[PDB]
Design a protein around this ligand. Structure first.
Ligand SMILES: *[C@@H]1O[C@H](CO)[C@@H](O)[C@H](O)[C@H]1NC(C)=O
Ligand SMILES: *[C@@H]1O[C@H](CO)[C@@H](O)[C@H](O)[C@H]1NC(C)=O
Ligand SMILES: [Mg+2]
Ligand SMILES: [Mg+2]
Ligand SMILES: [Mg+2]
Lengths: 178, 244, 190, 200, 13
């Protein structure tokens, strides 16, 4: 038993759109809206398969049009903000000096708009910071992963700061070596 | 329920700006421009959906532009025409935004881009009365229309009998012949036939007319030569019924 | 802050595969904000309105013969096709798990410590992790965090055992996963 | 990226059946369209092929689709002169843009009944000397070739249908600005039947 | 081989 999901959205007034392919909860690829090109989750997938970004681009234009049609039909009814659940974990068990990745998991939220900043000793970090797009869910909410490659030390304290319209204040999820 | 295109034909100088007009099918969501250089394949230029360009060609983008003046018209603009831009320009439209349907084509706009407008010549039209020998042998009568010395190509020849256009008993050459084949901008020749019964030709109350619609210089062009301006005109010739 | 109302148009095209590609259930679902208004189920054959908001799209999309034909053919042209494109690096993706056994705290024996069996960076999600006292299966006192997606095509599981150790103790973690032929074991000593 | 049609040109006798092929890419296939393009008219959509091994029929015209091999066949049953056109095939990928083939130009040779080959001289309604020579009422097997002489102009064979009088006829026109020029020598380059009527 | 987008249609206005 397997599941292949084509997930697409368009949000207003943000003007943010998304088109992605999913296989059993994992992203196969997405289309970069700004660059207008296919972005494979793992570089190797680009060798094993192909995709025409235009098919995705044509669908985004339709969702943009349908959003306008649906808003007008619903008498301009807005989305109810569902705040996310924030979890911080590591790629493998933590060992001092041994390279590892801090994973910030953002789950069960809507609308698919979030501001995520990594905080080492209270300061923002960008070095090697990679992120996934908004991943689909069975209950029609969204998932998001944020990554931070790091050198584990007894000197450093880490935090994932998450900003969402459903939160009263920015959520901070703490991590430190123990 | 079809796509409309204006004008039918257009003749302009190299480096000038052309605006091709289109009336897509009213409820259709996607609009397109395709072009065909004579002897070449039908080539995609641009697609349009929800007030924006979806797909565009390598031929498009450079001095090529599309516009939606209102919710009825669609235009293609070539800012600086080149000799390679001489083609049949087709406007198309399709109903669905999903693209799983047929594309409806317009009649097309035949665009002729010329380096020099001096090469342009209107046709000379002559009607040739049916042979009495043919009347005495078959009891049928064929008139011959000859349109000669025209440049550029793609004229519209039509027969008119008693003030009305006829198609039955008519046959026109699908391609014109070159008067001087040892020339790049050779003047063309075209023929057509209209066959009627001898009884119909013998009636002097019956009127026969051959019309040739020529496409040349516009009503905003440079004409410094001695001869008359070779503008878009209808050159005609006629014949009345003869008992004999 | 930004308090402006938000409007979301969301859509999912789902391909559910059973017994390989023998059974395929296709769903084309449309969502306005959090609400599902219309869907195409390959088991019904046509578009059906979920809410009253989806009724215009139900009758309009079913009237559009080319769009409806595209949906009725999706099981083979779309679902079965994309399954085949991915198959080798998707269904046949195999990554062996890294198994590490460590105690949560450096507490002395006769007291208490939580024995952690870390199973990380593996694919697919199918995993069976078992704890053994010495050679006998310990079923009681097992704290698992369950299956965790890392979002980079790898999984992880932290299975913990409640331990009261004394002098000569040999606890072992047994992990069986489709990527491995032999179930790999990791032994821990007090 | 590239679509090819075979053959480039095709000649078929009235009532007899023909077929021609279209080759398209086997990768990223969505649809294959067929268009009928008659001389003065605009391209008319004939078929939209999506499903492999599915055959569609539009009167006497049939179309087959083979996605794996990347080929499409268009069949014309009991060809009528009304079927004479350039038949274009177009491939559609994930977007909307169509990739066209070179087309198959189909010419349906009509059934010429009651032949009466003859060469007549037609005079101008305004005059003079420049008259036309009309070779008419010959069968479809008779072919009209080029002039060979620069001062003489010859047009290719053209079929007219007297719709109300249910009669079809072939014709070619010859003209020249020469004193020597006559209808008897006008159609020299072509094989004219011995029974051709040259009036006295 | 190519992944195929399931083309979306415009909603009823
Ligand atoms: C639509 O929205 C406005 C504003 O809240 C309201 O006047 C109206 O009652 C609503 N419902 C309908 C059916 O128009
Ligand atoms: C996220 O980032 C942008 C830019 O500062 C802003 O519009 C928005 O208010 C931010 N906050 C949240 C909760 O999304
Ligand atoms: Mg690619
Ligand atoms: Mg069809
Ligand atoms: Mg057949």
């Amino acid at each position: 038993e397997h599941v292949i999901i084509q997930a697409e959205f368009y949000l207003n007034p943000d003007q943010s759109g998304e088109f992605m392919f999913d296989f059993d909860g994992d992203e196969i690829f997405h289309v970069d809206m700004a660059k207008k090109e296919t972005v494979w989750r793992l570089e190797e997938f680009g060798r094993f398969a192909s995709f025409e970004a235009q098919g995705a681009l044509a669908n985004i234009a339709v969702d943009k049009a349908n959003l306008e049609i649906m808003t007008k039909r619903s008498n301009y009814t807005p989305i109810t903000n569902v705040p996310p659940e924030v979890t911080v974990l590591t790629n493998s068990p933590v060992e001092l000096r041994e390279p590892n990745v801090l994973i910030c998991f953002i789950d069960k939220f809507t609308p698919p708009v979030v501001n995520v900043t990594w905080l080492r000793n209270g300061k923002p970090v960008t070095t090697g910071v990679s992120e996934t797009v908004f991943l689909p869910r069975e209950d029609h909410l969204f998932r998001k992963f944020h990554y931070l490659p790091f050198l584990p030390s007894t000197e450093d304290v880490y935090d994932c700061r998450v900003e969402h319209w459903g939160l009263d204040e920015p959520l901070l999820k703490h991590w430190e070596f123990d | 329920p079809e796509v409309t295109q204006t004008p039918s034909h257009q003749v302009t100088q190299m480096g000038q700006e052309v605006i091709l007009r289109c009336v897509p099918i009213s409820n259709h969501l996607y609009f397109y421009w395709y072009r065909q250089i004579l002897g070449q394949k039908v080539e995609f230029l641009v697609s349009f959906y929800n007030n924006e360009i979806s797909e565009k060609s390598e031929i498009f983008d450079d001095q090529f532009s599309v516009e939606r003046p209102d919710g009825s018209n669609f235009t293609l603009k070539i800012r600086s025409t080149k000799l390679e831009d001489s083609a049949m320009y087709f406007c198309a439209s399709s109903r669905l935004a999903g693209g799983m349907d047929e594309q409806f084509f317009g009649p097309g706009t035949r665009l002729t881009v010329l380096e020099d407008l001096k090469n342009v010549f209107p046709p000379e039209v002559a009607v040739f009365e049916p042979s009495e020998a043919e009347i005495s042998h078959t009891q049928k009568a064929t008139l011959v229309c000859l349109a000669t010395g025209f440049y550029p190509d793609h004229v519209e020849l039509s027969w008119w009998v008693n003030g009305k256009e006829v198609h039955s008993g008519v046959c026109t050459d699908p391609q014109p012949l070159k008067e001087q084949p040892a020339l790049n901008d050779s003047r063309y020749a075209l023929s057509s036939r209209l066959r009627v019964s001898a009884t119909f030709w013998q009636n002097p109350r019956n009127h026969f007319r051959c019309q040739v619609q020529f496409y040349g210089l516009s009503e905003n062009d440079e004409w410094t030569q001695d001869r008359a301006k070779p503008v878009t005109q209808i050159v005609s010739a006629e014949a009345w019924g003869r008992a004999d | 802050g930004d308090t402006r109302p938000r409007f979301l148009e969301y859509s999912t095209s789902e391909c559910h595969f059973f017994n390989g590609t023998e059974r395929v259930r296709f769903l084309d679902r449309y969502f306005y904000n959090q609400e599902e208004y219309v869907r195409f189920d390959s088991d019904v054959g046509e578009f059906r309105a979920v809410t009253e908001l989806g009724r215009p799209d139900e009758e309009y999309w079913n009237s559009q013969k080319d769009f409806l034909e595209d949906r009725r053919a999706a099981v083979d042209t779309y679902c079965r096709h994309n399954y085949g494109v991915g198959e080798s690096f998707t269904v046949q993706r195999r990554v062996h798990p890294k198994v590490t056994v460590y105690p949560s705290k450096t507490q002395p024996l006769q007291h208490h410590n939580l024995l952690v069996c870390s199973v990380s960076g593996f694919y697919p999600g199918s995993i069976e992790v078992r704890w053994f006292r010495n050679g006998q299966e310990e079923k009681t006192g097992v704290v698992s965090t369950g299956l965790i997606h890392n979002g980079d095509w790898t999984f992880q599981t932290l299975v913990m055992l409640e331990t009261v150790p004394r002098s000569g103790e040999v606890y072992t973690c047994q992990v069986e996963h489709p990527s491995v032929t032999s179930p790999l074991t990791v032994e821990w000593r007090a | 990226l590239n679509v090819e049609q075979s053959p480039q040109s095709l000649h078929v006798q009235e009532g007899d059946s023909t077929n021609f092929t279209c080759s398209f890419p086997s990768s990223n296939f969505y649809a294959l369209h067929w268009y009928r393009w008659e001389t003065a008219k605009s391209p008319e959509a004939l078929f939209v092929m999506t499903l492999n091994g599915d055959e569609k029929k539009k009167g006497r015209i049939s179309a087959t689709l083979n996605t794996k091999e990347g080929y499409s066949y268009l069949y014309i049953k009991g060809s009528q002169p009304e079927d004479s056109a350039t038949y274009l095939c177009a491939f559609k990928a994930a977007g909307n843009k169509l990739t066209f083939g070179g087309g198959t130009r189909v010419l349906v040779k009509p059934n010429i009944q009651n032949p009466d080959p003859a060469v007549y001289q037609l005079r101008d309604s305004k005059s003079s000397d420049k008259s036309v020579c009309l070779f008419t009422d010959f069968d479809s097997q008779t072919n009209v070739s080029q002039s060979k002489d620069s001062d003489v102009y010859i047009t290719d064979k053209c079929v007219l249908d007297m719709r109300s009088m249910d009669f079809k006829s072939n014709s070619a026109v010859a003209w020249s600005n020469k004193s020597d020029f006559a209808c008897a020598n006008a159609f020299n380059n072509s094989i004219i039947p011995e029974d051709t009527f040259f009036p006295s | 081989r190519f992944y195929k987008t399931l083309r979306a249609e415009q909603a009823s206005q």
